[PDB]
Amino acid sequence: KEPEQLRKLFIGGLSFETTDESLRSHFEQWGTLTDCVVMRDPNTKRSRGFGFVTYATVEEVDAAMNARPHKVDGRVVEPKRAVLTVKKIFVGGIKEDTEEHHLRDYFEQYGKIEVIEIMTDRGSGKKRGFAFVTFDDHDSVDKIVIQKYHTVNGHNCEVRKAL
Numbered sequence: 001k002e003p004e005q006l007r008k009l010f011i012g013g014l015s016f017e018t019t020d021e022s023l024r025s026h027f028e029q030w031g032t033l034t035d036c037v038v039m040r041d042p043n044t045k046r047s048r049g050f051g052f053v054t055y056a057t058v059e060e061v062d063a064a065m066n067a068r069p070h071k072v073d074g075r076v077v078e079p080k081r082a083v084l085t086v087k088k089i090f091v092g093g094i095k096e097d098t099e100e101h102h103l104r105d106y107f108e109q110y111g112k113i114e115v116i117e118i119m120t121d122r123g124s125g126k127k128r129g130f131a132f133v134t135f136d137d138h139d140s141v142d143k144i145v146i147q148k149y150h151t152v153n154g155h156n157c158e159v160r161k162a163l
């Protein structure tokens with residue numbers, strides 16, 4: 001079974017009227033939920049406006065994020081994977097032979113790409129062996145950076161969030 005941390009979505013922006021039960025009924029549409037909690041004040045029991053769900057598999061997490069925007073009890077919520085919410089990554093170790101279509105063909109299966117920037121030397125124009133990819137949405141980056149490995153154009157690349 002995949003580590004539970006990778007099966008969790010933190011849900012921000014909840015309606016204060018959302019409950020464990022109503023959050024579960026909503027998010028069960030996209031997979032089996034092993035956990036579903038609305039965070040509440042320990043004294044007043046008033047909702048703190050966020051919670052989390054835990055799916056049985058990572059593919060269910062994917063399915064849930066692909067079904068965004070989620071309107072839950074009348075309010076659009078903000079689901080994010082557990083870990084810095086950015087849309088850009090640094091891709092290192094691609095050397096001089098890696099081109100734009102290599103990066104695009106690989107990274108477009110993580111999300112919609114808006115910019116690919118292959119870095120070149122300011123003086124010579126030679127490729128410097130790293131690039132930046134900007135996506136239209138943060139979940140692409142979140143999926144990317146929790147992988148142990150990235151292989152592009154035969155290279156094992158180092159990939160991290162970029163600000």
Ligand SMILES: COc1ccc(NC(=O)Nc2cccs2)cn1
Pocket residue numbers: 010011012013050051078079080081082083
């Ligand atoms: C380790 O990642 C975490 C851990 C705790 C948290 N707490 C939160 O407030 N969760 C969120 C609400 C909406 C989106 S993120 C977030 N991310």
